[PDB]
Enzyme design. Structure first.
Site, PDB file in Angstrom:
ATOM      1  N   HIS A 486       0.832  -1.192   0.000  1.00 25.32           N
ATOM      2  CA  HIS A 486       0.000   0.000   0.000  1.00 25.32           C
ATOM      3  C   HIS A 486       0.877   1.256   0.000  1.00 25.32           C
ATOM      4  O   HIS A 486       0.988   1.898  -1.038  1.00 25.32           O
ATOM      5  CB  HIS A 486      -0.987  -0.083   1.156  1.00 25.32           C
ATOM      6  CG  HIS A 486      -2.000   1.022   1.173  1.00 25.32           C
ATOM      7  ND1 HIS A 486      -2.783   1.292   2.273  1.00 25.32           N
ATOM      8  CD2 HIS A 486      -2.382   1.911   0.220  1.00 25.32           C
ATOM      9  CE1 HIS A 486      -3.586   2.311   1.998  1.00 25.32           C
ATOM     10  NE2 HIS A 486      -3.352   2.727   0.760  1.00 25.32           N
ATOM     11  N   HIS A 491       1.052   5.046  -2.986  1.00 24.00           N
ATOM     12  CA  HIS A 491       1.322   6.397  -2.520  1.00 24.00           C
ATOM     13  C   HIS A 491       2.726   6.888  -2.848  1.00 24.00           C
ATOM     14  O   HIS A 491       2.882   7.932  -3.486  1.00 24.00           O
ATOM     15  CB  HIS A 491       1.083   6.416  -0.995  1.00 24.00           C
ATOM     16  CG  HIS A 491      -0.361   6.318  -0.590  1.00 24.00           C
ATOM     17  ND1 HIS A 491      -1.125   7.434  -0.377  1.00 24.00           N
ATOM     18  CD2 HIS A 491      -1.207   5.260  -0.425  1.00 24.00           C
ATOM     19  CE1 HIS A 491      -2.374   7.069  -0.096  1.00 24.00           C
ATOM     20  NE2 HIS A 491      -2.454   5.749  -0.106  1.00 24.00           N
ATOM     21  N   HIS A 677      -3.950   0.457  -6.447  1.00 26.17           N
ATOM     22  CA  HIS A 677      -4.274   1.135  -5.201  1.00 26.17           C
ATOM     23  C   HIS A 677      -5.647   0.736  -4.695  1.00 26.17           C
ATOM     24  O   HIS A 677      -5.812   0.479  -3.509  1.00 26.17           O
ATOM     25  CB  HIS A 677      -4.142   2.644  -5.361  1.00 26.17           C
ATOM     26  CG  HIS A 677      -4.541   3.373  -4.125  1.00 26.17           C
ATOM     27  ND1 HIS A 677      -5.767   3.974  -3.973  1.00 26.17           N
ATOM     28  CD2 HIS A 677      -3.925   3.494  -2.915  1.00 26.17           C
ATOM     29  CE1 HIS A 677      -5.875   4.451  -2.736  1.00 26.17           C
ATOM     30  NE2 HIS A 677      -4.771   4.177  -2.065  1.00 26.17           N
ATOM     31  N   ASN A 681      -6.350  -0.784  -1.063  1.00 24.80           N
ATOM     32  CA  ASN A 681      -6.853   0.270  -0.185  1.00 24.80           C
ATOM     33  C   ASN A 681      -8.272   0.023   0.324  1.00 24.80           C
ATOM     34  O   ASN A 681      -8.525   0.135   1.524  1.00 24.80           O
ATOM     35  CB  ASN A 681      -6.756   1.628  -0.913  1.00 24.80           C
ATOM     36  CG  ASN A 681      -7.161   2.806  -0.005  1.00 24.80           C
ATOM     37  OD1 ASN A 681      -6.316   3.487   0.592  1.00 24.80           O
ATOM     38  ND2 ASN A 681      -8.424   3.049   0.059  1.00 24.80           N
ATOM     39  N   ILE A 826      -6.731   8.581  -1.298  1.00 25.80           N
ATOM     40  CA  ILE A 826      -6.977   8.376   0.122  1.00 25.80           C
ATOM     41  C   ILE A 826      -6.027   7.324   0.656  1.00 25.80           C
ATOM     42  O   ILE A 826      -5.780   7.324   1.882  1.00 25.80           O
ATOM     43  CB  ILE A 826      -8.474   8.025   0.370  1.00 25.80           C
ATOM     44  CG1 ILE A 826      -8.828   8.076   1.855  1.00 25.80           C
ATOM     45  CG2 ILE A 826      -8.830   6.680  -0.225  1.00 25.80           C
ATOM     46  CD1 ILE A 826      -8.488   9.385   2.545  1.00 25.80           C
TER      47      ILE A 826
HETATM   48 MN   LIG Z   1      -4.428   4.601   0.103  1.00 25.60          MN
END
Ligand SMILES: [Mn+2]
Length: 826
Positions: A486, A491, A677, A681, A826
């Site tokens: 993750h 990110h 993602h 996520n 997010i």
């Molecule tokens: Mn995320």
């Protein structure tokens, strides 16, 4: 005389958190010619033209938007407008949505998609410029716009100096030297991540706050972690500003919870599994002052049902919506390795026993202690299981072993470096058949605890030992998921590409237009994460096993990160879960046929690939056109040499001298930002909202026979489990964060959608994009049929009866366990 009629759409600041004030001489626009130039070759600039009145006759703008009329003088000497300057003479910034120059024909309408904050003119070195929605590679830029295009890129790059201010739009790189807080306490000092061979790391957006006094290499604290202004998304509804919840959670909610424990107002530990289930049933009773602190905060207030007085109640996690206990089955433990929150680490195992690449001179004999003859493979021999490609593993041995000693020296952390053997049953499900719990034994610095192998058992104390072995594995997996699958791979890995794109591809550029939707909110969530999620004493360090070693472990793993292995087919092949097969639609054959993440992922991957393959030829007909695009060449050179600069010498970087390389690079970027993602996520709370299913930490090793801890395993297995995993206080904090991060804001832009239908004037690009969206809808229908296929129940639903919907392209707002955003938002 002739005038060009225009409509300006803007949002006053209070909408994103009197219209007559915008009239008068408050806001000047000046059109800029794309076709007629001054003596220096720059497009001619018209006179200051002010907003004339409010337009209320338009067919319903979006919420919070207002439209204003303007009329420009524009005689024959001025050519065709292709850009404009805007100056805001008001004190307060406003959000400029668009300018539209109306024409007799819809064909002649000139559109400018702006979506940018415009601060007071005295805060800008140079006047804000916006371009019409035409698309140009550099060799196609109209000559009167060439210098403006380049000067705007220079403005966006800045000069590498200075503290970045709220209104700055300056994109540049820095290392992760802003996570520690050594001027406060030496307990809070952290190694700089990036810029060395010891701790290589992706770069992040430069903020420039300046050095701390105690360590010139670490960046001082600030109340606001800058991002370039238009990266900091405003939202019409506060509840959609999900990114701000991390800061509130760490700075306000976490101390509030801590006070309830310090005052002994709530039990310090969970004492049965029902105490955990209570969190989403009746809730948790807390002191009134703790409730009052927590419940009025934006974003945070949405996380809990409350009576306003005494109770916080968490939502019921998806994983327990049908069965409260199915998480504890071996079936579900293995199924989540292919359809859970972290479905991308399992590997094929082609020999037995498994091997380590670590040096026994450091850690002692690294030979695996699992024996083939100890396994129950449903009647298969080991040779048959290997030859038929039915053996797999979840291998954390070499990843965790180098960190075990230092983790285990911490108060209340104890881990093993785990390895789980999985067998693919004839029914197509995975069966866990052994867990190896390894510890380093340096001969001269060990302790007394030993490594061991645990086999499945359903009865007696051995069943509790096996349950605990599964917990040790899932602690390893949870850490690897959050920090590597993750944080690192989505990110952190993506942010260098965001920065390079804004620095080197004009807003006019076709590849800017292709990629930038896939960056929405990524710098913003990341900056807020550096401040409150991955900082010293932040949310992850205070809730996950490795504590202060958490982020550096991700840097150790980044040593092995390979951009081209992020492509889904390459990942599957590299992990030994698929083989190359040109006779299949996707060019790979899965070795676990019903592998829900991989099977659904290949559909999405193929759809993105078709889109990129259709879009690129609209702008590049030949390999030499890719070679000849100076913005594209500078972009990729900088993304690699600066953005991922600690890996710049690796041989696997695409060189970007061909159409096929440009397609591959864009496809991988879009895949990482959207589907990869989403898959890692949006299952965080659905699977991890029950702490027993996804423990974040382990606090003790297995007990020795003849101790009270061993007797507790015999007499009170739930308490033994709860004492081993994350304690109640960090559980409350971590459940809260993963609930935030699993929520879709109502203003999300999903794969197959854009934020404006006029992002380009090029009809072929618009048509290709429509086909992509239609394909995604067809894929969703196919994935629904898969979930409804009773033959696939074992892996797509499991005993938790939770249909695998994480790669459904679309979703409504909320905690939905489905929907693929365009970006890491997010
Ligand atoms: Mn995320």
């Amino acid at each position: 005389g002739h005038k060009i009629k225009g409509t300006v759409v803007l949002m006053p600041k209070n909408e994103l958190e009197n219209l007559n004030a915008f009239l008068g001489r408050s806001v000047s626009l000046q059109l800029i010619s794309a076709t007629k130039a001054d003596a220096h070759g720059k497009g001619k600039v018209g006179k200051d033209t002010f907003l004339e009145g409010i337009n209320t006759s338009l067919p319903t703008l979006g919420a919070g938007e207002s439209a204003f009329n303007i009329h420009f003088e524009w005689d024959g000497s001025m050519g065709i407008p292709g850009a404009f300057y805007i100056k805001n003479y008001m004190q307060v910034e406003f959000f400029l949505k668009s300018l539209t120059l109306e024409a007799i024909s819809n064909q002649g309408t000139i559109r400018f998609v702006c979506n940018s904050w415009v601060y007071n003119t005295k805060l800008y070195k140079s006047v804000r410029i916006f371009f019409a929605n035409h698309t140009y590679v550099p060799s196609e830029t109209p000559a009167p716009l060439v210098e403006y295009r380049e000067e705007e890129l220079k403005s966006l790059r800045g000069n590498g100096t200075g503290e970045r201010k709220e209104y700055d739009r300056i994109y540049d790189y820095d290392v992760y030297n802003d996570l520690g807080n050594p001027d406060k306490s030496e307990k809070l000092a952290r190694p700089v991540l990036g810029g060395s061979s010891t701790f290589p790391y992706p770069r992040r957006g430069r903020t420039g706050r300046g050095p701390t006094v105690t360590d010139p290499n670490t960046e001082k604290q600030g109340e606001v972690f800058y991002v370039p202004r238009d990266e900091n998304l405003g939202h019409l509804k506060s509840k959609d500003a999900l990114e701000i919840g991390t800061k509130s959670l760490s700075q306000i909610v976490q101390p509030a919870f801590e006070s309830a424990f310090d005052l002994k107002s709530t039990p310090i530990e969970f004492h049965s599994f029902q105490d955990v289930h209570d969190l989403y049933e009746g809730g948790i009773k807390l002191p009134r002052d703790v409730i009052s602190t927590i419940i009025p905060l934006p974003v945070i207030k949405e996380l809990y049902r409350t009576d306003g007085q005494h109770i916080l109640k968490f939502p019921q996690p998806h994983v327990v919506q049908v069965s409260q206990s199915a998480w504890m089955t071996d079936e579900e433990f293995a199924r989540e390795m292919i359809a859970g929150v972290n479905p991308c680490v399992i590997r094929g195992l082609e020999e037995f026993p498994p091997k380590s690449n670590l040096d026994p001179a450091i850690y002692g004999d690294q030979s695996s202690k699992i024996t083939a003859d100890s396994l129950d493979l449903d009647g298969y021999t080991m040779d048959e299981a290997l030859g038929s490609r039915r053996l797999f593993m979840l291998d954390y041995h070499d990843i965790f072993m180098p960190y075990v000693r230092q983790i285990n020296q911490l108060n209340s952390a104890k881990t093993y470096a785990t390895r789980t053997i999985l067998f693919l049953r004839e029914d197509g499900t995975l069966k866990p058949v052994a867990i190896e719990l390894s510890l380093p034994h340096s001969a001269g610095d060990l302790s007394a605890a030993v490594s061991q192998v645990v086999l499945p058992a359903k009865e007696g104390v051995e069943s509790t030992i096996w349950l605990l072995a599964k917990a040790y594995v899932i602690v390893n997996d949870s850490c690897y998921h959050q920090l590597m699958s993750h944080w690192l791979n989505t990110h952190a890995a993506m942010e260098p590409f965001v920065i390079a794109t804004h620095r080197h591809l004009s807003v006019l550029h076709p590849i800017y237009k292709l990629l930038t939707p896939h960056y929405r909110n990524n710098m913003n969530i990341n900056a807020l994460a550096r401040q409150s999620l991955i900082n010293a004493n932040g949310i992850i360090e205070t809730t996950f096993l490795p504590s202060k070693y958490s982020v550096e472990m991700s840097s150790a793993v980044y040593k092995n990160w390979v951009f081209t292995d992020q492509a889904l087919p390459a990942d599957l092949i590299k992990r030994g879960v698929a083989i190359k097969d040109p006779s299949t639609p996707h060019g790979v054959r899965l070795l676990i046929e019903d592998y829900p993440y991989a099977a659904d992922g290949l559909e999405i991957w193929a759809a993105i690939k078709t889109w990129v393959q259709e879009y690129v030829p609209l702008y590049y007909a030949r390999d030499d056109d890719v070679k000849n695009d100076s913005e594209l060449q500078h972009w990729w050179k900088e993304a690699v040499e600066k953005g991922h600069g600690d890996l710049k010498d690796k041989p696997w970087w695409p060189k970007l001298q061909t159409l096929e390389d440009l397609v591959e690079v864009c496809l991988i970027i879009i895949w990482i930002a959207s589907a990869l993602h989403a898959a890692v996520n949006f299952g965080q709370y659905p699977y991890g909202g029950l702490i027993m299913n996804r423990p974040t930490a382990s606090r003790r090793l297995l007990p020795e026979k003849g101790t009270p801890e061993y007797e507790e395993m015999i007499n009170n297995h739930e308490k033994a489990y709860l004492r081993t995993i994350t304690s109640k206080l960090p559980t409350l904090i971590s459940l809260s964060v993963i609930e935030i991060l699993s929520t879709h804001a109502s203003d999300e832009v999903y794969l197959g959608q854009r934020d404006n239908p006029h992002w380009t004037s090029d009809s072929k690009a618009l048509q290709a994009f429509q086909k992509f969206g239609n394909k995604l809808k067809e894929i969703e229908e196919k994935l629904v049929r898969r979930n409804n296929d009773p033959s696939l129940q074992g892996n797509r639903l499991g005993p938790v009866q939770l249909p695998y919907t994480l790669l459904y392209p679309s979703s409504e707002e909320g905690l939905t366990f489905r929907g693929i955003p365009n970006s890491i938002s997010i």
